[PDB]
Structure 1
């Protein structure tokens, strides 16, 4: 016998389609190849493509699919349709699998609504733990959407029991609105900034800020994005940049590698796809967790009995027998995925026991610690803590030096020819620069003070010079 699985995706159709359809096909083909899971049954599916929005058409497709009947449904990807989809699934006792976060049903939790993605409050206490490890009492966080506070709510509660002070900013829709805000960031000196935003924005956010050039060793940057590899990788700065973030995609266990590079070679064999800046060929979180959900379907399937096709109406309310048994057996589904260890609490279908590996840039990578739900911040690596005889990053910065005219420290050289460059002067200071550069390599150029004084107060509380 064969198994029927149905999936509907709502996406714009005026560019090449979403890639998770291809990932789903790859997963089902791969499990069809392997007979070590289930030899007497092979997965079969009908794929349906519809334009996004217009949840009425989604209801029509749901009726068409239940006319055939399957064991689970994938999609839709918009919150509007999924409400009615879960309502009808509860009406017909059909368990539903989803691969994207939606607004949680706190008024009444549906028994049939199963999602595999780390929670926003999960990221919230994870970032609580990491900021407490870094012991900083002044940080600035900024988001772009009303759901970002759902990710950073416990950071908002942090002052209620700590001495932390928070500087929260908001990003208005469109990528042209960050230009004023970064100017105010110039006006007010802060170095501890958090960008709580989707990964699709992070590429051009980094591009813009490097266009201004605010990444220096003065600044420490952290993103709420759970994948740093997928983002554009231009950060090979010899100026020193503090970049930190999460990682959930496993890279070790060379079987996992074989999976990731077979995906990477199957992506490139197709004609190139234009992108916004994100590197194409490496795993994305949504498709990886969808792959894990396909394997959830498989592990649910091998213990289930033979499939029985059913004919029903979306306007009818007669339950179908096997829905409860697949729901119950899926409730105790346990496996190890690309995102890591998967299990479900016995009170909800939300994913649990999440893996969050912090990863930082220093190879212009390294293990520091992990976080897990059954404990706190597991500090795995204590770091090797290198110290160098000469501490400079290959001397790739022009030092800004401001000076004034005073004998014998600074004076014009005795010559009758026009003066140019950084050698229009001489003195003890220029010496100090030359031996410091020789002993500790670094670049600099001379600038004159526009004021012409050392600096003093004016009774206004503002210094000068």
Structure 2
């Protein structure tokens, strides 16, 4: 028997396509090569490409795919379509796997909505722990979007129980708006700043800061971004600069290194792709957790029986029998992937027990400490604490 798995992606088509489709193809091919997962089952898929927006078209493609029928669905990548997608999936008791953060459903938790990505509020506890460790009572935090404040809730309520004073700054959309705010950073002397922003902007934010020349050893810089390796690495200052951040992509265990360098050999064998400043060839978080979700599906299917195709309508409301069984089998699934060990709590399809490795630049790197949701900020290294003649 073979397995049918469905993926719909809404991305711009005036430019070369998204890369996590490539990652999904590599992962499914990889499991098709290895027979240690299922020697009698080979995973198959039909891939459908659509221009972004027009959620009616997303629903139409969902109807097209439901005409055939699969065990799980990937995408859409925008909040508008996923509302109707989850509505119809819940009506059809079809579990839905998604690979990016969306606004959480606090009205009623969908039991068929399963996401693999570390939570904002967990990151908020993490930044609390790191800032308390560095024992700083004056910090200035700036974001560019309404969602960003949700990643910083506990800091916002931090003065309610601490002596901390907070300076909240906002970035208007477009990258030409930071030029003023940096000048007001000149006017009021500050050294302790947090940029809560997507990794898309951090590259040219660093470029602008180095152009103006504010990064020195006077300043302490920290980003909410979860990967510093992917970011542009021009930081080899002999002027002294303090750079700190998180890391989630495991780089030890030479099997993991082998997997990533297979992907790092595959990207380049295809012609060059023009970028914004991000280095092409080192793994991105979303596609990495896509790679992990593929193996979620694989291990889930390793318990299930042979697939049974069904024909239904997207305007009908008759549930399909193996849906509850598959969502249960997903529910008690636990694995070890690139982001670390993944498991799910018994009240939501939200991800838990995230790994957050603190990394700082000093080789112009070094283990400092880790955080987990099952404990606090675990100080692993006491540091060797060099002093020079």
Partners of 1:271 and 1:35 in 2: how far apart? 32
1:145, CA displacement in angstroms? 0.1
1:45, CA displacement in angstroms? 0.1
Runs of 4+ in structure 1 off by over 4 angstroms are none
**Equivalent position of 1:371 in the other structure:** 371
Gaps of 5+ in 1: 390-465
1:271, CA displacement in angstroms? 0.1
1:130, CA displacement in angstroms? 0.2
1:16, CA displacement in angstroms? 0.2
Partners of 1:256 and 1:78 in 2: how far apart? 30
Per-residue CA shift, 1:251-310, capped at 9, x if unaligned?
000000000000000000000000000000000000000000000000000110000000
**Equivalent position of 1:222 in the other structure:** 222
Partners of 1:93 and 1:25 in 2: how far apart? 27
> Greater RCO between the two (CA within 8 Å, min separation 6)?
2
1:235, CA displacement in angstroms? 0.1
Gaps of 5+ in 2: none
1:113, CA displacement in angstroms? 0.2
Per-residue CA shift, 1:82-131, capped at 9, x if unaligned?
00000000000000000000000000000100000011101100000000
Per-residue CA shift, 1:52-98, capped at 9, x if unaligned?
00000000000000000000000000000000000000000000000
Alignment of 1:38-53 (within 5 A): 38-53=38-53
Per-residue CA shift, 1:326-374, capped at 9, x if unaligned?
0001000110010001000000000001100000000000000000111
Partners of 1:178 and 1:101 in 2: how far apart? 26
**The residue matched to 1:114 in structure 2 has which SS?**
strand
1:231 aligned to 2:250? no
1:196, CA displacement in angstroms? 0.2
Partners of 2:294 and 2:83 in 1: how far apart? 22
Per-residue CA shift, 1:154-184, capped at 9, x if unaligned?
0001000000000110000000000000000
**The residue matched to 1:162 in structure 2 has which SS?**
coil
Partners of 1:330 and 1:378 in 2: how far apart? 30
**Equivalent position of 2:182 in the other structure:** 182
Partners of 2:69 and 2:350 in 1: how far apart? 25
1:28, CA displacement in angstroms? 0.1
**The residue matched to 1:147 in structure 2 has which SS?**
helix
TM-score, structure 1 normalization: 0.84
Number of residue pairs aligned between Structure 1 and Structure 2: 389
1:25, CA displacement in angstroms? 0.1
Partners of 2:180 and 2:375 in 1: how far apart? 42
Partners of 2:376 and 2:164 in 1: how far apart? 20
Alignment of 1:134-283 (within 5 A): 134-283=134-283
Task: Answer with 1 or 2: which has the greater Rg.
Answer: 1
1:4, CA displacement in angstroms? 0.1
Per-residue CA shift, 1:199-240, capped at 9, x if unaligned?
000000000000001000000000000000000000000000
Aligned Cα root-mean-square deviation (Å): 0.3
Partners of 1:52 and 1:310 in 2: how far apart? 28
Per-residue CA shift, 1:26-55, capped at 9, x if unaligned?
000000000011000100000000000000
Alignment of 1:375-386 (within 5 A): 375-386=375-386
1:376, CA displacement in angstroms? 0.3
Partners of 1:374 and 1:44 in 2: how far apart? 37
1:353 aligned to 2:353? yes
TM-score, structure 2 normalization: 1.00
